[model samples]
Structure formats: C-alpha cells, structure tokens
Target: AGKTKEGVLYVGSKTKEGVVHGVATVAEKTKEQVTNVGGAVVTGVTAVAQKTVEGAGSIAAATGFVKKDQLGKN
Candidate 1:
C-alpha cells in the first residue's frame, strides 16, 4: 500500500469473496492500462483489507476509496 501523510492507498481487498472479486478487477484493469501505457505494474494481497469488520459493505456503501478531503493533500 502507498500512504501519504494522511493515510493509505493501493490497499487490497478482504476475505469477502465479492469484495475480492471486485477489487481484483480494478487492480487488473489498472495494471493493464498502466502497462499498455509503458509503465510497469506490481500488486499483492493482504489480510484485514477493511479498516473495520463493518467496513465491509455493498458497492453503494463502499466509499472507502472516495476520500475527497485527502485529494490534493498528504
């Protein structure tokens, strides 16, 4: 994971199969586009992907990646 002074990014998915399935797609597409653009790509899977047990949720409830406050800031 990549972290700024504020928090982390590039974090992986969880034990939730659906969550893992979704996150896996994003990382795959990201790597595909990155490599297509001549950049190298690397990735990994780790446990406890959600910050809390209840942090797991459906797509509508999954706003963990949308940190407006952290944008353009550390």
Candidate 2:
C-alpha cells in the first residue's frame, strides 16, 4: 500500500499490475498521452498565474502603489 502526494491511497500490488496492463494495452497509450498533455498545460497555466500575481504585488509594494497600512496588515 502507498499514499501519493495528493493523499490518495493505493495498493502497491494492484498498482503494479495496472501499470503493466496499461503499458501493454494500445488504448491506454492515447489516454496516457492526452493526460500528460493536459497536466503540462495545467502546470504552465498555474505557474504563469502565480508569477504574474507575485510580480505585480512586488512592483506595487516597491513603487508605493500599496500603502504602508496595507503592508503592515499583511
């Protein structure tokens, strides 16, 4: 048994069998490819959104666009 980072529990033996089956199955290839692509796109979007927010916040604070009281509150 094992737990993923997302806290999902899995049986190790079953997981291994499924993984092997997936590798040997033709239909799983396209499904896995699409899953990989979707994951990459989601990761890119999240990274960009976080960077944008942090950059804008830093610039605003440095240029006094954000007040002292607001900074103090945070």
Candidate 3:
C-alpha cells in the first residue's frame, strides 16, 4: 500500500512468507497504525482474503483503503 491521501501515507507487505517448510499465515492486523477505542469501531473489518501476486504487487502503491469514507458506522 502506498498512501490514502495520495502522498501522505501507505501500507502493505509481501504476499508470501517464503517458507518452503511448514507453518502458514494468519491474516490479521497484529499491529496497526491506529485504532478506534470508542464503544464500537468505525472502520470495522467486513471481509478479508489473500490476493494474488499480481494484485498484491501494488502493496506499496496504496497506504490504506479509504473504505466508504466519512465513517463505516456512526
């Protein structure tokens, strides 16, 4: 991911761990830039999945997903 505000910030990483042995991946935001601490979350994750190499190649091209803008729930 590159940035949400075009040139402000961006995020994302490798699509694979490059481990030819055992163990796999756990798709979760172990760490995040920010998080909402209200009674509920604003941009609550809806659905997530693994993208192809070609799709994940632009990982450094987008800092973050703006989602629906404003707020997911208000």
Candidate 4:
C-alpha cells in the first residue's frame, strides 16, 4: 500500500519468494518513535486494566463472591 491523506503511512506491497520485483515501499519511522508510541499504548491500557480489575475485585468482595482478603490477590 501507499501513503494517503491524514498523516497515515501505508506500507509494503505484495511480497513474494526468491528475487523480489516492483517498486518497493520505502516506509520510514525511527525506532525511537516506535518505542515511544508502543509505550504510550501499553501504559494507558495497563493503567485502565489495573483500575478495572480493582473495581471488579471490590464488587466481588461486596457481593460475597470473594473474601475481602482475596479481593486483590489476583
């Protein structure tokens, strides 16, 4: 695919075996950029998941589905 509107960087094409052919896509993004974005997504999702788990644990403890001491063990 090729790059298009809205700051999107489309990449690559139909890959094949042996000798490759055609105009190869020259996509470029630094490793640092990739690392930063990856960390951003990972950290955000992790934090939200942590909060959700805590909330669910509280609900389980209140509903007698789990002991209060066991709420956060998992």
Clashes of 4: 0
Stretches off by above 4 angstroms in model 2 are 1-38, 42-74
Q: What residue pairs are clashing in model 1?
A: none
lDDT (Cα, 0-100) at 8 in candidate 1: 41
Model 3 residue 52 distance off true place after TM-score fit, in angstroms:
34
Candidate 4 lDDT, 8-66, residue by residue in tens: 43333453354323357455543644212112122112111122233335322222233
User: TM-score: which candidate is best?
Assistant: 3
lDDT of 2 by residue, 1-74 (tens): 98445433323222223374465576633443322211211211211112223333532222223333334454
- Residue 11's lDDT within candidate 3 is 36
Please provide, for model 1 over 1-74, each residue's C-alpha lDDT reduced to its tens digit, 9 standing for 90 to 100: 88454324454334433453365465544433321323435434233333433754653332233333445655
- Stretches off by above 4 angstroms in model 3 are 1-5, 22-74
Q: Give the range of the ten consecutive residues with the poorest summed lDDT in model 1.
A: 31-40
- Deviation (Å) of 13 in candidate 4: 0.4
lDDT value for model 4: 0.33
**Total colliding residue pairs, candidate 1:** 0
Candidates, ranked, lDDT: 3, 1, 4, 2
Candidate 3, residues 14-40, lDDT tens digits: the string is 344355333675655455556333343
- Residue 53, candidate 1: C-alpha displacement in angstroms: 4.1
